[PDB]
Amino acid sequence: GSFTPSGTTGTTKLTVTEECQVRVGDLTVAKTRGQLTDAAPIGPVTVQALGCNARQVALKADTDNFEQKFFLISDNNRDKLYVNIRPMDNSAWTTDNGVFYKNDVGSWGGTIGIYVDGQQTNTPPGNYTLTLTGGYWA
Amino acid sequence: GSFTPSGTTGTTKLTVTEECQVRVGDLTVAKTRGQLTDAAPIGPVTVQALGCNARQVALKADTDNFEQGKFFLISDNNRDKLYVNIRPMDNSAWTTDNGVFYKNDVGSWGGTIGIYVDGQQTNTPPGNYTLTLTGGYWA
Amino acid sequence: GSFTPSGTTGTTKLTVTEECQVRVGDLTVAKTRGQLTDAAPIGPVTVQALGCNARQVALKADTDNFEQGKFFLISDNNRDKLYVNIRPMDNSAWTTDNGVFYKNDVGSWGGTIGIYVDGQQTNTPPGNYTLTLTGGYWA
């Protein structure tokens, strides 16, 4: 099985902060380390496939967003926040080295929820990101 | 003549995908190589020149978006290119001079600049292509 | 006292142009050098401090946005600069300490920070200027 890039690239950006969070400029997903408890929901990624009725929809994370496990990477390319990626509808998906594809072919379209994998309330403040690219599995 | 930078910089981003395009995020201008036929319309650029009553409104593309009097979107790898044609929705007369696309007549013009595929290029490798244009006048 | 980074980073982008102003993009703030008079208002930065009921809300500008107790927008060339004044429309009391703009009183303040031109600089070369500010507290 190999992932074929065929879609747009989405990004989940989260700004971890101390209890005293000062949101300057535009508004984004901001969370204090304290809120980084297990199962804690981060953002959500909207996916929409077209003309994929004979292929398995899949999402591919940047090389710096997965290892052995998905996680958001700090701007320093150091600190990481381990998260779990699952669709809103209870569709069945598989995780294969940075790839998250649907077990059944079809032009699926829904929401992919991002949650904190295990309490990590000690996560250093900063800007974390998680990039995912559309495509199919085959 | 020469182009004088005096305005904002706009960008036309197109994502080329295979027949099975999976849009992660929301939203962009995605198109399958199959749709990359000749005259195929990509995105559109809205232009608004003001105080240009004695000058000629002009648009300047990045050095990596033009060559030999030909405009094209560049891949994120600064390698693959999609040749496109620049033309206003209204049939106004413009001129192309080395990456510069200026209007033949002076005055403050405003409207939409349509971007179309120049010749069928359905073999264009998938990826993220862009076309940057900067506002200014010609002299 | 030192500034502790704890919030998001905002940015004020301005595009100085000549009287002939050609807007190519969808939306991006533009202004001709002529409008760059003293007290001239640029953009505005929204500030939302939360859980800061025992800390002094503060804003920190990039190293290339301040110098000698003076704030300014920097050109894309890291050369030209537009000196501006930072002030809360709440008329609240703030202090400027080497790139840091913090509130004199603790509390989870939330409002608008107005950006105005510091002294007439109508000769400012055209280009893209920016001013980055990061949320956090002072102590």
Short mmCIF file of C-alpha atoms in Angstrom, two decimals:
data_model
loop_
_atom_site.label_atom_id
_atom_site.label_comp_id
_atom_site.label_asym_id
_atom_site.label_seq_id
_atom_site.Cartn_x
_atom_site.Cartn_y
_atom_site.Cartn_z
CA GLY A 1 0.00 0.00 0.00
CA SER A 2 1.24 3.46 -0.96
CA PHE A 3 -0.27 6.90 -0.49
CA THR A 4 -0.97 8.93 -3.63
CA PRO A 5 -1.07 12.70 -3.13
CA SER A 6 -4.26 14.01 -4.72
CA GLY A 7 -5.89 16.86 -2.81
CA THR A 8 -5.24 20.01 -0.77
CA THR A 9 -3.12 20.38 2.35
CA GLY A 10 -4.84 21.30 5.61
CA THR A 11 -3.24 22.50 8.84
CA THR A 12 -4.20 22.35 12.50
CA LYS A 13 -2.51 25.15 14.43
CA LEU A 14 -2.70 25.38 18.21
CA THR A 15 -1.16 28.00 20.49
CA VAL A 16 -0.39 26.60 23.94
CA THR A 17 -0.13 29.24 26.67
CA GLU A 18 0.04 29.78 30.42
CA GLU A 19 -3.11 30.29 32.48
CA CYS A 20 -2.73 33.98 31.68
CA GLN A 21 -3.36 33.90 27.93
CA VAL A 22 -3.14 37.14 25.94
CA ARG A 23 -4.68 36.66 22.49
CA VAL A 24 -3.22 39.34 20.22
CA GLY A 25 -4.25 40.04 16.63
CA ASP A 26 -6.54 37.63 14.77
CA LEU A 27 -8.20 34.77 16.64
CA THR A 28 -6.89 31.20 16.63
CA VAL A 29 -7.09 28.01 18.67
CA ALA A 30 -5.57 28.90 22.03
CA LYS A 31 -5.21 26.50 24.96
CA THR A 32 -3.39 26.68 28.29
CA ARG A 33 -1.12 23.77 29.22
CA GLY A 34 -3.67 23.01 31.91
CA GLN A 35 -6.32 22.29 29.28
CA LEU A 36 -3.97 19.79 27.62
CA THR A 37 -5.58 16.90 29.50
CA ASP A 38 -6.16 13.48 27.93
CA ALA A 39 -8.89 13.30 25.28
CA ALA A 40 -8.83 17.09 25.25
CA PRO A 41 -10.17 18.19 21.88
CA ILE A 42 -8.00 20.54 19.83
CA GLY A 43 -9.27 21.71 16.45
CA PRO A 44 -11.09 19.79 13.73
CA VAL A 45 -10.13 19.15 10.12
CA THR A 46 -12.70 19.35 7.33
CA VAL A 47 -12.24 16.79 4.57
CA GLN A 48 -14.09 16.45 1.27
CA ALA A 49 -13.30 13.90 -1.43
CA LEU A 50 -14.48 14.08 -5.05
CA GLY A 51 -14.41 11.26 -7.60
CA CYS A 52 -13.07 8.70 -5.13
CA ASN A 53 -15.75 6.01 -5.40
CA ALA A 54 -13.20 3.39 -6.43
CA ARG A 55 -10.40 4.52 -4.12
CA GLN A 56 -9.68 4.64 -0.37
CA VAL A 57 -9.68 8.23 0.91
CA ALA A 58 -6.52 8.97 2.89
CA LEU A 59 -4.71 11.73 4.78
CA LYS A 60 -0.92 12.08 4.95
CA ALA A 61 0.84 13.99 7.72
CA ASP A 62 4.14 15.82 7.25
CA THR A 63 7.22 13.79 8.16
CA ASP A 64 7.57 15.97 11.26
CA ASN A 65 4.02 15.20 12.40
CA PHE A 66 4.25 11.44 12.92
CA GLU A 67 6.65 8.84 14.24
CA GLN A 68 6.13 5.16 15.06
CA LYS A 69 1.86 8.15 16.43
CA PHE A 70 0.54 11.54 15.32
CA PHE A 71 1.58 14.80 16.98
CA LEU A 72 1.71 18.56 16.49
CA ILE A 73 5.19 20.03 16.14
CA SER A 74 6.49 23.19 17.81
CA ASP A 75 7.89 26.03 15.71
CA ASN A 76 11.31 24.97 16.98
CA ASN A 77 10.81 21.54 15.41
CA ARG A 78 11.45 20.27 18.94
CA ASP A 79 8.48 20.01 21.31
CA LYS A 80 5.60 17.78 20.21
CA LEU A 81 2.01 17.31 21.33
CA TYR A 82 0.77 13.77 20.73
CA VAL A 83 -2.79 13.68 19.42
CA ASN A 84 -5.34 11.13 18.20
CA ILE A 85 -6.99 11.51 14.80
CA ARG A 86 -10.51 10.17 14.39
CA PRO A 87 -13.51 11.06 12.23
CA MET A 88 -16.72 12.44 13.73
CA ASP A 89 -18.87 9.74 12.15
CA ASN A 90 -17.69 6.36 13.38
CA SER A 91 -16.22 5.37 10.02
CA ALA A 92 -13.34 2.87 10.08
CA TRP A 93 -9.83 4.12 9.33
CA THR A 94 -6.29 2.74 9.43
CA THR A 95 -2.99 4.29 10.49
CA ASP A 96 0.04 3.32 8.43
CA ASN A 97 3.20 5.37 8.94
CA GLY A 98 1.86 8.93 8.83
CA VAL A 99 -1.04 7.85 6.63
CA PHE A 100 -4.65 7.77 7.81
CA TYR A 101 -6.87 6.13 5.20
CA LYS A 102 -10.48 4.95 5.13
CA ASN A 103 -11.05 1.18 5.19
CA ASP A 104 -13.78 1.48 2.53
CA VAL A 105 -13.64 3.15 -0.88
CA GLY A 106 -16.03 6.03 -1.59
CA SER A 107 -16.03 9.83 -1.84
CA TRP A 108 -16.32 10.35 1.92
CA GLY A 109 -16.76 13.85 3.32
CA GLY A 110 -16.89 14.73 7.01
CA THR A 111 -14.98 16.04 10.01
CA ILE A 112 -11.78 14.62 11.48
CA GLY A 113 -11.53 15.33 15.21
CA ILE A 114 -8.14 16.01 16.80
CA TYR A 115 -7.75 15.08 20.47
CA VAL A 116 -4.86 15.10 22.94
CA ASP A 117 -3.33 11.64 23.33
CA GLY A 118 -2.67 11.31 27.06
CA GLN A 119 -2.47 14.19 29.53
CA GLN A 120 0.44 16.45 28.54
CA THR A 121 -0.19 19.50 30.73
CA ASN A 122 3.55 20.11 30.91
CA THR A 123 3.78 20.94 27.21
CA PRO A 124 5.97 24.03 26.80
CA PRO A 125 4.16 27.10 25.50
CA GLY A 126 4.56 27.86 21.80
CA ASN A 127 3.01 27.37 18.36
CA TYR A 128 2.24 23.78 17.39
CA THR A 129 1.04 22.58 13.99
CA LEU A 130 -0.21 19.45 12.25
CA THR A 131 -0.22 19.29 8.46
CA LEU A 132 -2.36 16.78 6.55
CA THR A 133 -2.54 16.24 2.79
CA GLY A 134 -5.44 14.73 0.85
CA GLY A 135 -5.01 11.70 -1.40
CA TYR A 136 -5.88 8.02 -1.81
CA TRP A 137 -4.54 4.65 -0.66
CA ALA A 138 -3.65 1.82 -3.05
CA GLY B 1 9.23 52.17 -20.29
CA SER B 2 9.45 50.78 -16.75
CA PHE B 3 7.10 49.46 -14.07
CA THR B 4 6.72 51.39 -10.82
CA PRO B 5 5.61 49.32 -7.83
CA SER B 6 2.69 51.11 -6.20
CA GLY B 7 0.01 48.79 -4.83
CA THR B 8 -0.63 45.48 -3.08
CA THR B 9 0.51 42.01 -4.13
CA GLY B 10 -2.13 39.46 -5.11
CA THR B 11 -1.70 35.71 -5.54
CA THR B 12 -3.47 33.05 -7.59
CA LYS B 13 -3.02 29.64 -5.98
CA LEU B 14 -4.13 26.48 -7.76
CA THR B 15 -3.79 22.93 -6.51
CA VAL B 16 -3.48 20.33 -9.25
CA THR B 17 -4.78 16.92 -8.25
CA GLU B 18 -5.51 13.53 -9.81
CA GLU B 19 -9.07 12.45 -10.62
CA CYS B 20 -9.52 11.62 -6.92
CA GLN B 21 -8.93 14.97 -5.22
CA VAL B 22 -9.26 15.02 -1.44
CA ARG B 23 -9.61 18.56 -0.10
CA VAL B 24 -8.23 18.69 3.43
CA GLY B 25 -9.06 22.07 4.91
CA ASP B 26 -11.30 24.72 3.36
CA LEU B 27 -10.92 26.13 0.80
CA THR B 28 -8.78 26.63 -2.31
CA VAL B 29 -8.81 26.36 -6.10
CA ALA B 30 -8.25 22.67 -6.78
CA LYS B 31 -8.33 21.25 -10.30
CA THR B 32 -7.55 17.80 -11.72
CA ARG B 33 -4.97 17.55 -14.51
CA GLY B 34 -7.89 16.45 -16.65
CA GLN B 35 -9.56 19.84 -16.20
CA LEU B 36 -6.35 21.55 -17.31
CA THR B 37 -7.63 21.82 -20.89
CA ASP B 38 -6.98 24.84 -23.11
CA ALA B 39 -8.85 28.03 -22.19
CA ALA B 40 -9.69 26.33 -18.89
CA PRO B 41 -10.38 29.09 -16.38
CA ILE B 42 -8.41 29.03 -13.14
CA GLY B 43 -9.05 31.73 -10.56
CA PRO B 44 -9.63 35.45 -11.03
CA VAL B 45 -7.84 38.56 -9.82
CA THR B 46 -9.69 41.66 -8.67
CA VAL B 47 -7.90 44.91 -9.50
CA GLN B 48 -8.63 48.40 -8.18
CA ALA B 49 -6.49 51.29 -9.39
CA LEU B 50 -7.18 54.71 -7.87
CA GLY B 51 -5.53 58.09 -8.44
CA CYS B 52 -4.11 56.73 -11.69
CA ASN B 53 -5.71 59.45 -13.79
CA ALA B 54 -2.57 60.35 -15.71
CA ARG B 55 -0.83 57.00 -15.59
CA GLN B 56 -1.23 53.47 -16.93
CA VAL B 57 -2.39 50.81 -14.47
CA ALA B 58 -0.09 47.79 -14.54
CA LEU B 59 0.49 44.38 -12.94
CA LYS B 60 3.92 42.84 -12.38
CA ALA B 61 4.43 39.10 -11.97
CA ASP B 62 7.21 37.58 -9.86
CA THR B 63 10.37 36.71 -11.79
CA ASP B 64 9.42 33.05 -11.42
CA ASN B 65 5.99 33.61 -12.97
CA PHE B 66 7.01 34.87 -16.41
CA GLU B 67 9.56 34.23 -19.17
CA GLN B 68 9.79 35.28 -22.83
CA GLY B 69 6.45 37.14 -22.75
CA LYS B 70 4.66 34.13 -21.25
CA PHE B 71 2.88 33.97 -17.89
CA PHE B 72 2.67 30.79 -15.82
CA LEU B 73 2.01 29.47 -12.32
CA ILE B 74 5.01 27.96 -10.57
CA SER B 75 5.07 24.73 -8.56
CA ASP B 76 6.22 24.75 -4.94
CA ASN B 77 9.37 23.09 -6.28
CA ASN B 78 10.19 26.10 -8.48
CA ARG B 79 10.25 23.58 -11.30
CA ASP B 80 6.91 22.64 -12.85
CA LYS B 81 4.94 25.44 -14.50
CA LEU B 82 1.40 25.91 -15.78
CA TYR B 83 1.23 28.40 -18.64
CA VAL B 84 -1.77 30.71 -18.39
CA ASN B 85 -3.25 33.70 -20.20
CA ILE B 86 -4.02 36.98 -18.43
CA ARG B 87 -7.00 38.99 -19.70
CA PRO B 88 -9.56 41.31 -18.13
CA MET B 89 -13.24 40.38 -17.96
CA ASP B 90 -14.06 43.60 -19.80
CA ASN B 91 -12.38 43.65 -23.19
CA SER B 92 -10.06 46.50 -22.20
CA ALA B 93 -6.77 46.65 -24.10
CA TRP B 94 -3.62 45.70 -22.23
CA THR B 95 0.01 45.06 -23.15
CA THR B 96 2.47 42.40 -22.04
CA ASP B 97 6.06 43.54 -21.58
CA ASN B 98 8.42 41.15 -19.79
CA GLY B 99 6.33 40.09 -16.79
CA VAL B 100 4.46 43.40 -16.89
CA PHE B 101 0.82 43.50 -17.91
CA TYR B 102 -0.21 47.13 -18.32
CA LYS B 103 -3.31 48.78 -19.75
CA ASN B 104 -2.94 50.55 -23.11
CA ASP B 105 -5.02 53.53 -21.95
CA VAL B 106 -4.36 55.80 -18.97
CA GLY B 107 -6.79 56.53 -16.12
CA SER B 108 -7.89 54.73 -12.96
CA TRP B 109 -9.21 51.31 -13.99
CA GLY B 110 -10.85 48.68 -11.82
CA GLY B 111 -12.22 45.22 -12.55
CA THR B 112 -11.48 41.50 -12.75
CA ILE B 113 -8.49 39.86 -14.42
CA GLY B 114 -9.34 36.36 -15.64
CA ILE B 115 -6.71 33.61 -15.55
CA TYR B 116 -7.02 30.85 -18.15
CA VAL B 117 -4.92 27.84 -19.11
CA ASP B 118 -2.74 28.55 -22.15
CA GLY B 119 -2.96 25.38 -24.24
CA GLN B 120 -4.06 21.97 -22.97
CA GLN B 121 -1.63 20.82 -20.26
CA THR B 122 -3.49 17.85 -18.78
CA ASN B 123 -0.16 16.18 -18.01
CA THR B 124 0.76 18.81 -15.43
CA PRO B 125 2.18 17.05 -12.37
CA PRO B 126 0.07 17.36 -9.24
CA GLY B 127 1.17 19.97 -6.69
CA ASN B 128 0.67 23.55 -5.55
CA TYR B 129 1.04 26.22 -8.22
CA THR B 130 1.04 29.98 -7.66
CA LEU B 131 1.03 33.24 -9.61
CA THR B 132 2.00 36.47 -7.86
CA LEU B 133 1.05 39.88 -9.26
CA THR B 134 1.94 43.30 -7.86
CA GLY B 135 0.04 46.55 -8.46
CA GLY B 136 1.73 49.64 -9.91
CA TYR B 137 1.88 51.91 -12.96
CA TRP B 138 3.73 52.03 -16.28
CA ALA B 139 5.86 54.89 -17.62
CA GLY C 1 10.82 43.07 35.07
CA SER C 2 10.78 40.65 32.13
CA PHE C 3 8.18 39.72 29.52
CA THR C 4 6.76 36.20 29.56
CA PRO C 5 5.44 34.95 26.22
CA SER C 6 1.95 33.55 26.79
CA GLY C 7 -0.48 34.22 23.95
CA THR C 8 -0.85 34.46 20.18
CA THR C 9 1.11 36.63 17.76
CA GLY C 10 -0.73 39.38 15.88
CA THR C 11 0.46 41.36 12.88
CA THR C 12 -0.31 44.81 11.48
CA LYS C 13 0.42 44.91 7.76
CA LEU C 14 0.36 48.15 5.78
CA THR C 15 1.12 48.71 2.09
CA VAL C 16 2.46 52.18 1.29
CA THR C 17 1.91 53.22 -2.32
CA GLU C 18 2.08 56.34 -4.48
CA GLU C 19 -0.97 58.44 -5.32
CA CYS C 20 -1.46 55.85 -8.05
CA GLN C 21 -2.63 52.97 -5.90
CA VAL C 22 -3.41 49.69 -7.63
CA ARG C 23 -4.92 47.04 -5.36
CA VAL C 24 -4.23 43.63 -6.87
CA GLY C 25 -5.18 41.35 -3.99
CA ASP C 26 -8.58 40.55 -2.54
CA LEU C 27 -7.90 42.44 0.65
CA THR C 28 -4.81 43.99 2.20
CA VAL C 29 -4.60 47.46 3.76
CA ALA C 30 -3.22 50.22 1.50
CA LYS C 31 -2.34 53.88 2.00
CA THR C 32 -0.46 56.45 -0.09
CA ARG C 33 2.59 58.20 1.38
CA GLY C 34 0.47 61.36 1.35
CA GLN C 35 -1.86 59.87 3.97
CA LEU C 36 1.14 59.12 6.19
CA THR C 37 0.63 62.36 8.12
CA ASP C 38 1.17 62.64 11.87
CA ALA C 39 -1.42 60.91 14.07
CA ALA C 40 -2.61 59.16 10.92
CA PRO C 41 -4.33 55.96 12.02
CA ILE C 42 -3.11 52.71 10.47
CA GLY C 43 -4.77 49.46 11.50
CA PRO C 44 -5.93 48.29 14.92
CA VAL C 45 -4.90 45.30 16.98
CA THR C 46 -7.49 43.40 18.98
CA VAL C 47 -6.30 42.21 22.38
CA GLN C 48 -8.02 39.49 24.40
CA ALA C 49 -6.41 38.80 27.77
CA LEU C 50 -7.89 35.97 29.83
CA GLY C 51 -6.91 34.40 33.16
CA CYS C 52 -4.64 37.40 33.69
CA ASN C 53 -6.38 38.62 36.83
CA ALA C 54 -3.13 38.62 38.81
CA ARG C 55 -0.68 39.48 36.04
CA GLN C 56 0.04 42.57 33.94
CA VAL C 57 -1.10 42.06 30.35
CA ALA C 58 1.68 42.88 27.89
CA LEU C 59 2.53 42.95 24.19
CA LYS C 60 5.99 42.25 22.77
CA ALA C 61 7.09 43.49 19.35
CA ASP C 62 9.59 41.66 17.15
CA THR C 63 13.19 42.80 17.53
CA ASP C 64 12.88 44.46 14.12
CA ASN C 65 9.82 46.45 15.19
CA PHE C 66 11.27 48.53 18.01
CA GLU C 67 14.40 50.42 19.01
CA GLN C 68 15.24 52.99 21.72
CA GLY C 69 11.71 53.03 23.13
CA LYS C 70 10.21 53.55 19.66
CA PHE C 71 7.81 51.29 17.76
CA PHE C 72 7.76 51.08 13.96
CA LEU C 73 6.62 48.93 11.05
CA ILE C 74 9.41 47.32 9.04
CA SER C 75 9.64 47.12 5.25
CA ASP C 76 9.97 43.74 3.53
CA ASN C 77 13.58 44.77 2.91
CA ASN C 78 14.37 45.05 6.63
CA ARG C 79 15.51 48.55 5.64
CA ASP C 80 12.75 51.20 5.70
CA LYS C 81 10.65 51.82 8.81
CA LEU C 82 7.44 53.66 9.64
CA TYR C 83 7.43 54.96 13.22
CA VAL C 84 4.07 54.51 14.92
CA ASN C 85 2.47 55.06 18.33
CA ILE C 86 0.73 52.24 20.20
CA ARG C 87 -2.26 53.20 22.34
CA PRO C 88 -5.35 51.58 23.84
CA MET C 89 -8.59 53.29 22.85
CA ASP C 90 -9.71 52.45 26.39
CA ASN C 91 -7.45 55.25 27.54
CA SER C 92 -6.01 52.72 29.98
CA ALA C 93 -2.51 53.19 31.38
CA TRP C 94 0.33 51.30 29.70
CA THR C 95 4.12 51.36 29.81
CA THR C 96 6.75 50.99 27.10
CA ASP C 97 9.88 49.07 28.06
CA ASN C 98 12.20 48.03 25.24
CA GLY C 99 9.75 46.56 22.71
CA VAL C 100 7.29 45.67 25.46
CA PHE C 101 3.93 47.40 25.88
CA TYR C 102 2.35 46.31 29.16
CA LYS C 103 -0.64 47.49 31.20
CA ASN C 104 0.11 49.39 34.41
CA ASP C 105 -2.61 47.47 36.28
CA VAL C 106 -3.15 43.73 36.63
CA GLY C 107 -6.40 42.24 35.30
CA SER C 108 -7.75 40.27 32.33
CA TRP C 109 -8.12 43.31 30.04
CA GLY C 110 -9.64 42.96 26.56
CA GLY C 111 -9.89 45.76 23.99
CA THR C 112 -8.45 47.45 20.91
CA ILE C 113 -4.92 48.78 20.49
CA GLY C 114 -4.83 51.67 18.02
CA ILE C 115 -1.81 52.14 15.74
CA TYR C 116 -1.04 55.69 14.62
CA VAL C 117 1.73 57.32 12.60
CA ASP C 118 4.33 58.94 14.86
CA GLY C 119 5.16 62.23 13.13
CA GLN C 120 4.47 63.05 9.49
CA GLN C 121 6.43 60.64 7.29
CA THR C 122 4.88 61.28 3.87
CA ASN C 123 8.22 60.48 2.24
CA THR C 124 8.07 56.83 3.29
CA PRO C 125 9.11 54.69 0.32
CA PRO C 126 6.35 52.49 -1.08
CA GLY C 127 6.38 48.84 -0.03
CA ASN C 128 4.99 46.35 2.48
CA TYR C 129 5.42 47.25 6.14
CA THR C 130 4.60 45.05 9.12
CA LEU C 131 4.41 45.17 12.91
CA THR C 132 4.36 41.93 14.89
CA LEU C 133 3.12 41.79 18.48
CA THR C 134 3.04 38.78 20.81
CA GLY C 135 0.75 38.30 23.81
CA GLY C 136 2.10 37.62 27.30
CA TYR C 137 2.48 39.09 30.79
CA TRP C 138 4.93 41.37 32.58
CA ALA C 139 6.57 40.74 35.96
#
